[PDB]
Amino acid sequence: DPFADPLDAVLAELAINIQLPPGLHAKAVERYEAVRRYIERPGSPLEGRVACFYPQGSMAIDATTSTRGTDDEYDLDIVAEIEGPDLGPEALLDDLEAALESYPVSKVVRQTRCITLYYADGMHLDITPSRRRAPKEKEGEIPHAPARYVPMNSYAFGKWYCARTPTEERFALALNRQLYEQAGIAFAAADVEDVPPQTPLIIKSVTTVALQLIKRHRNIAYATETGRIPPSVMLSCHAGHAARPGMRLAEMLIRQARWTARAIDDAAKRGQLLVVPNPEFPVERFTDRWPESQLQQTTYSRHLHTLANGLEAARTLEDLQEWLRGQFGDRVVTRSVKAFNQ
Ligand SMILES: Nc1nc2c(ncn2[C@@H]2O[C@H](COP(=O)(O)OP(=O)(O)OP(=O)(O)O)[C@@H](O)[C@H]2O)c(=O)[nH]1
Ligand SMILES: [Mg+2]
């Protein structure tokens, strides 16, 4: 039972408290499908020009957390694959921004590579337009606007990650029952095969839960950083590489922290920067924007060693709760320790 051991159990409670809550989780797909419907409407510049709409990033791998700087807002990443004449990356973003004009949300913000839709309830959407470039699903490019195209295959990365993280029945059933119970909902499933469709699995894998805690640790250590932060797709890639069936949560969290820290250390030893290719599309590097310098990567490695070393000292819990507050956030740790008390 993932709640039997005290350290594994408090980490599980922490992970439950950073998930996309069930009520919002149940709205996410319809939300982005409504965006697609809007940009496909008559008069839109992108009328007839949308090939497909798909989640990328955390939503593609059931890894969504509260967004950096907050405990109660969430960002979802959606790709709009666009067809027709290619007149450059800036014009592609221009078309997407124009198609999203007057969309009834709190605010629409044009970013360097995407258009952001901020929603009143705190679950936001980043819409990245893409151009398909090759037959493989879904090998192509995204705009950066000098303006340039950037190769990517986030679709195949998501599928690759999911293949490495098959649902772990005992773990998933236990953590989902608690996630839903905290939200006032009866999650009633004896087996992962016949979960009631009204209460689907949100949590599926110890590997992903550890990855969510890695991202939370990152979000706390860089909560107010306005510069570049360690990228989640690099962390998600390493989590996929580190995936091991049947591992306990603390053990896996230590393993993933040391995976990234040691990879950084080995590059730094050579005066080189961390390099992490897309397993499904090796010309794409998940390290193309980060790290920019030795200081950046070695700073993050030091944070990761501190996390791994403290969790390992705990395996070998009132002093631990204070240390956890510094690593994962005061309020979320307080809420989790309360649940573990009962
Ligand atoms: N190659 C590359 N892709 C990126 C980079 N940043 C974002 N992406 C792509 O955009 C997707 C969404 O980015 P993120 O929001 O940072 O990833 P995430 O897994 O959703 O992480 P969280 O939002 O922190 O939960 C990623 O899965 C990547 O496909 C980057 O620096 N390099
Ligand atoms: Mg994201």
CSV table of C-alpha atoms and ligand atoms in Angstrom, one decimal, residues 56-59 61 63-65 75 77 113 154 157 215 218-219 228 231-233 236 284-290, ligand 1:
chain,number,residue,atom,x,y,z
A,56,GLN,CA,1.4,18.3,-25.4
A,57,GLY,CA,3.4,18.6,-22.2
A,58,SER,CA,1.9,17.5,-19.0
A,59,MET,CA,-1.7,17.0,-20.2
A,61,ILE,CA,1.3,12.4,-20.0
A,63,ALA,CA,1.5,14.9,-15.2
A,64,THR,CA,-0.2,18.3,-14.7
A,65,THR,CA,0.6,20.2,-11.6
A,75,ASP,CA,-1.6,25.7,-17.4
A,77,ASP,CA,-0.4,23.1,-23.5
A,113,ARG,CA,5.8,30.7,-29.4
A,154,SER,CA,6.0,16.6,-28.9
A,157,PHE,CA,7.4,12.2,-27.1
A,215,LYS,CA,8.5,19.7,-11.1
A,218,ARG,CA,11.7,23.1,-9.4
A,219,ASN,CA,8.7,25.4,-9.1
A,228,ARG,CA,14.9,30.7,-17.9
A,231,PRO,CA,12.6,22.8,-18.6
A,232,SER,CA,9.9,20.3,-17.7
A,233,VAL,CA,10.2,18.4,-21.0
A,236,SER,CA,9.8,14.5,-18.2
A,284,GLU,CA,15.2,18.1,-31.3
A,285,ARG,CA,17.0,18.8,-28.1
A,286,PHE,CA,15.1,19.4,-24.9
A,287,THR,CA,18.1,21.4,-23.8
A,288,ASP,CA,17.9,23.9,-26.7
A,289,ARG,CA,16.8,26.7,-24.4
A,290,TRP,CA,18.3,25.6,-21.1
B,1,LIG,N1,12.6,21.2,-27.2
B,1,LIG,C1,12.0,21.9,-26.3
B,1,LIG,N2,10.6,21.8,-26.1
B,1,LIG,C2,10.0,22.6,-25.2
B,1,LIG,C3,10.8,23.5,-24.4
B,1,LIG,N3,9.9,24.1,-23.6
B,1,LIG,C4,8.6,23.6,-23.9
B,1,LIG,N4,8.7,22.7,-24.8
B,1,LIG,C5,7.6,21.9,-25.5
B,1,LIG,O1,6.4,22.4,-25.0
B,1,LIG,C6,5.7,21.4,-24.2
B,1,LIG,C7,5.1,22.1,-23.0
B,1,LIG,O2,6.1,22.7,-22.3
B,1,LIG,P1,6.0,22.7,-20.7
B,1,LIG,O3,4.8,23.4,-20.2
B,1,LIG,O4,7.3,23.4,-20.2
B,1,LIG,O5,6.0,21.1,-20.3
B,1,LIG,P2,5.1,20.4,-19.2
B,1,LIG,O6,5.5,18.9,-19.3
B,1,LIG,O7,3.7,20.7,-19.5
B,1,LIG,O8,5.6,21.0,-17.8
B,1,LIG,P3,4.7,21.8,-16.7
B,1,LIG,O9,3.9,22.8,-17.4
B,1,LIG,O10,5.8,22.5,-15.9
B,1,LIG,O11,3.9,20.7,-16.0
B,1,LIG,C8,6.8,20.4,-23.8
B,1,LIG,O12,6.3,19.1,-23.6
B,1,LIG,C9,7.7,20.4,-25.0
B,1,LIG,O13,7.2,19.6,-26.0
B,1,LIG,C10,12.1,23.6,-24.6
B,1,LIG,O14,12.8,24.4,-23.9
B,1,LIG,N5,12.7,22.8,-25.6
